[PDB]
Amino acid sequence: QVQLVQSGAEVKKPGSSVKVSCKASGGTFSSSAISWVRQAPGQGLEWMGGIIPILDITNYAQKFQGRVTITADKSTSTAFMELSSLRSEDTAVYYCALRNQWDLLVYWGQGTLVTV
């Protein structure tokens, strides 16, 4: 059983950056792919990017080719995402989710609310 602990809510100012952590449980940090999505109020849920820690390969959505950094720290089994150059349009609930190799399930967090 895999559960992901999300960061709490935060209020940012224009031009700043926000960093959100994703704490894994159930191990399997290596061998799984972690994705990040965001849901702006009134919108659907949109994929931003993601990383595979064992491969150390990071992929991003085209609209996020810049301003978004996705990394991971294997020693704490924690994944991270940072969004820079914030504006009010960036308000969203941010989520991490895992898709483990060997499985077909996706393990989702509660959601981190960030406004600017």
């Binding site: 399997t28 290596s30 061998s31 064992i54 491969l55 483990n100 190799q101 060997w102």
Partner: protein, 49 residues
């Protein structure tokens, strides 16, 4: 969905990494037996075909 045994389904796996720790350690399998290799060394080895 699984295939009938009389007409089993075989697939090719390639150009990827496999962490066999998960299958091995998971308690869900009734049978986990390897032939010619140690289950615990599957992660050290690299395979073809």
């Amino acid at each position: 969905r699984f295939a009938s045994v009389y007409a089993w389904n075989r697939k090719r796996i390639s150009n990827c990494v496999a962490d066999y720790s998960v299958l091995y350690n998971s308690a869900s399998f009734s049978t986990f037996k390897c032939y010619g290799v140690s289950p615990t060394k599957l992660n050290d080895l690299c395979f073809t075909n």
